[PDB]
Amino acid sequence: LSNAPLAASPGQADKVGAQATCAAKPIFFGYYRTWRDKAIELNDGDKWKDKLHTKLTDIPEQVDMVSLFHVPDNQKSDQRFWETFDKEYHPTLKERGTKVVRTIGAKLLLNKIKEKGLYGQSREDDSKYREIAHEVYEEYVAKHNLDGLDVAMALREVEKYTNLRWQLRKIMGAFSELMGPKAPGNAGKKPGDDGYKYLIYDTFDNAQLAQVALVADVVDYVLAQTYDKGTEESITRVWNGFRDKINSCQFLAGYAHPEENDTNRFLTAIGDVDTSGAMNVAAWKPEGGEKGGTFAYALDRDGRTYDGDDLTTLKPTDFAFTKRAIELTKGISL
Amino acid sequence: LSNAPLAASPGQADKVGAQATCAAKPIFFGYYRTWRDKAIELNDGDKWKKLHTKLTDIPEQVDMVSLFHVPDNQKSDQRFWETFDKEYHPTLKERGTKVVRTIGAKLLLNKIKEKGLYGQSREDDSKYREIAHEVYEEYVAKHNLDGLDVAMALREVEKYTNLRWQLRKIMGAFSELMGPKAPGNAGKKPGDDGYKYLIYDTFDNAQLAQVALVADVVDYVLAQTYDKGTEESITRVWNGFRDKINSCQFLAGYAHPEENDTNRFLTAIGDVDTSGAMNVAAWKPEGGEKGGTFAYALDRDGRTYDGDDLTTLKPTDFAFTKRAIELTKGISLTD
């Protein structure tokens, strides 16, 4: 209902560059594909209507934060899944102290912006951005008492068009009124405190394509999709790309587990765990500073490859990469 | 022109296994040797300078015919293509018979090598698109054909990772122009007018075929089951293929004996109703429907390797073709 203007981006967070100390300890972030959870009901003709081995609570208890990656087109119904989450998954995760956030694609946000009749400009009825933000917050976060929202922005057209940049900036500010460090509900709160509402941004590992300067001041964490790096020097190069827009405490580098029928080919998390590039990313730290943590995509595919039956079959997981990444990120032993 | 990366293979089609229903009804696929068409101009010294059959002689119930064109087998093809554009193709369009063109994978690999391309995830994938557009313009668009059929019978592809990458990338570049992934076929299905097919014919061994590299981009996979002729053997071949493709893509086939062939394919010899070729035509995957049945060298329908058949060309009554159409589509040709 507020009509206050959603201002332009300052271009950087309050503090930038490598930070020797951080307010919150490094976390392990995990993307969970809900259409691979045992409680979901896939379509009748789906080749994987069965063969669903993993539950959400199977993940290691030392996972600090898990993001539900929910795609409605990938299943027939999610009613059983959300009932199981409310009854079974979420109380267990709260008992473990594992935060649960929800991932939303920037394309859906831009579609909602377009339905509102909004272009991308400095002067517009910014209450409409707040309408979209509040509706998305109610549907995605508040409905199941989740801990925050993760906006996935992997669209190359945002960097090309000024109006799309304005749209992204304004919708992220409207979200910042509800989540993140700028939110009044988080007054006197810190990431890791109980009841904190996170605002998270996952995007390209190229800071220019990411347009992270548009969100740097309103987000708790920036997750750079370093799925092809796996080398300490390459992660350093990515961070040096980001270092003038955000501070190291916001930065998370990550890896992706091979997915069935994926065509993408991400190779850092294959083979021996202790010598993999994924664990180089997990162990990496900005020189002279501390990082926000490490993230992994598709926890259910921990240990899978693109060879043999892995490309066409689902299998249980031992979460070996996940456990070792937690150890290397937090400096603890499991 | 596009430099976007040609991605890797998902390893299987969107749907796999036996399918109770298919978008298109089972079809009969026919390979046509163009150097045996009456309109072709053979070499001056050629002993058969004796060409009995023309393309339009094939039964009208043939759903799809593939032109197997070899420049080294004739002097000139100008008269043949003029006859096709003027006479053959309008008649086939009236019958509703699709016409595709077969290209050998070895030629594609040679063009890949001329481009300086290796086989890896990196490289300049715009060159694969250059080759794909060149092949599409020369082979498909030039005579307003309905698609391309890539014949991959090379044992070295499965052996070498770089060759596997080359095959996957060239097939993806083709998929940008033909097949279910092509934007030109948006809102279209096989059987609609103007649909552009992407077809793959290969070994009847799924591992040697490397069908997992093309399963997601092709409309049909033709397994060369030329020595099977038994329902159980075709079932074993299909069980080899069933986790990579769905039954609607699968076609098993037979080969008619060719003159001076040395190959010896025996399934389509002798009495029609007791031949192995009609066992292949009648075969269906357990719990599902198949893409259809195909035959190589339609002009040799009914020929053997005995007597004068090995050294002479003859007209054909298309007996095997008609009975295979009947068994594949469940119709009768006596009316």
PDB file of all heavy atoms in Angstrom, chain B residues 14 23 57 91 174 205 298:
ATOM      1  N   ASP B  14      12.511 -37.871 -24.272  1.00  0.00           N
ATOM      2  CA  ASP B  14      11.603 -37.425 -23.218  1.00  0.00           C
ATOM      3  C   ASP B  14      10.809 -38.593 -22.650  1.00  0.00           C
ATOM      4  O   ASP B  14      10.672 -38.734 -21.430  1.00  0.00           O
ATOM      5  CB  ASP B  14      10.659 -36.346 -23.754  1.00  0.00           C
ATOM      6  CG  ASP B  14      11.327 -34.991 -23.869  1.00  0.00           C
ATOM      7  OD1 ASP B  14      12.531 -34.891 -23.552  1.00  0.00           O
ATOM      8  OD2 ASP B  14      10.645 -34.025 -24.271  1.00  0.00           O
ATOM      9  N   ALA B  23       1.940 -40.515 -31.395  1.00  0.00           N
ATOM     10  CA  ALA B  23       1.428 -39.334 -32.081  1.00  0.00           C
ATOM     11  C   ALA B  23       1.067 -39.656 -33.524  1.00  0.00           C
ATOM     12  O   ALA B  23       0.043 -39.189 -34.037  1.00  0.00           O
ATOM     13  CB  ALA B  23       2.455 -38.204 -32.022  1.00  0.00           C
ATOM     14  N   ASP B  57       6.482 -45.803 -59.228  1.00  0.00           N
ATOM     15  CA  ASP B  57       5.960 -47.162 -59.318  1.00  0.00           C
ATOM     16  C   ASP B  57       5.679 -47.777 -57.953  1.00  0.00           C
ATOM     17  O   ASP B  57       4.904 -48.736 -57.871  1.00  0.00           O
ATOM     18  CB  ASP B  57       6.935 -48.060 -60.083  1.00  0.00           C
ATOM     19  CG  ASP B  57       7.004 -47.722 -61.556  1.00  0.00           C
ATOM     20  OD1 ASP B  57       6.044 -47.117 -62.079  1.00  0.00           O
ATOM     21  OD2 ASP B  57       8.023 -48.064 -62.194  1.00  0.00           O
ATOM     22  N   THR B  91       3.215 -36.243 -57.733  1.00  0.00           N
ATOM     23  CA  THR B  91       2.447 -37.470 -57.542  1.00  0.00           C
ATOM     24  C   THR B  91       2.582 -37.985 -56.113  1.00  0.00           C
ATOM     25  O   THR B  91       1.587 -38.376 -55.486  1.00  0.00           O
ATOM     26  CB  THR B  91       2.902 -38.533 -58.542  1.00  0.00           C
ATOM     27  OG1 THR B  91       2.768 -38.025 -59.875  1.00  0.00           O
ATOM     28  CG2 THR B  91       2.063 -39.795 -58.400  1.00  0.00           C
ATOM     29  N   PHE B 174      21.629 -30.115 -36.566  1.00  0.00           N
ATOM     30  CA  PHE B 174      20.518 -30.537 -37.414  1.00  0.00           C
ATOM     31  C   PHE B 174      19.183 -30.381 -36.693  1.00  0.00           C
ATOM     32  O   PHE B 174      18.170 -30.032 -37.312  1.00  0.00           O
ATOM     33  CB  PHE B 174      20.713 -31.987 -37.862  1.00  0.00           C
ATOM     34  CG  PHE B 174      21.641 -32.145 -39.033  1.00  0.00           C
ATOM     35  CD1 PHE B 174      22.585 -33.159 -39.055  1.00  0.00           C
ATOM     36  CD2 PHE B 174      21.568 -31.283 -40.114  1.00  0.00           C
ATOM     37  CE1 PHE B 174      23.440 -33.309 -40.131  1.00  0.00           C
ATOM     38  CE2 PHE B 174      22.420 -31.429 -41.195  1.00  0.00           C
ATOM     39  CZ  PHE B 174      23.357 -32.443 -41.201  1.00  0.00           C
ATOM     40  N   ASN B 205      22.400 -52.830 -32.861  1.00  0.00           N
ATOM     41  CA  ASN B 205      22.978 -52.895 -31.527  1.00  0.00           C
ATOM     42  C   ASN B 205      23.009 -51.479 -30.967  1.00  0.00           C
ATOM     43  O   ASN B 205      23.689 -50.607 -31.518  1.00  0.00           O
ATOM     44  CB  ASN B 205      24.382 -53.501 -31.567  1.00  0.00           C
ATOM     45  CG  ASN B 205      25.011 -53.613 -30.191  1.00  0.00           C
ATOM     46  OD1 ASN B 205      25.385 -52.611 -29.582  1.00  0.00           O
ATOM     47  ND2 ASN B 205      25.138 -54.838 -29.698  1.00  0.00           N
ATOM     48  N   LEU B 298      13.993 -50.869 -52.430  1.00  0.00           N
ATOM     49  CA  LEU B 298      12.649 -51.231 -52.870  1.00  0.00           C
ATOM     50  C   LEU B 298      12.649 -51.811 -54.279  1.00  0.00           C
ATOM     51  O   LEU B 298      11.820 -52.673 -54.594  1.00  0.00           O
ATOM     52  CB  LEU B 298      11.725 -50.015 -52.806  1.00  0.00           C
ATOM     53  CG  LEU B 298      11.311 -49.527 -51.417  1.00  0.00           C
ATOM     54  CD1 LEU B 298      10.313 -48.386 -51.535  1.00  0.00           C
ATOM     55  CD2 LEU B 298      10.731 -50.668 -50.598  1.00  0.00           C
TER      56      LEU B 298
END
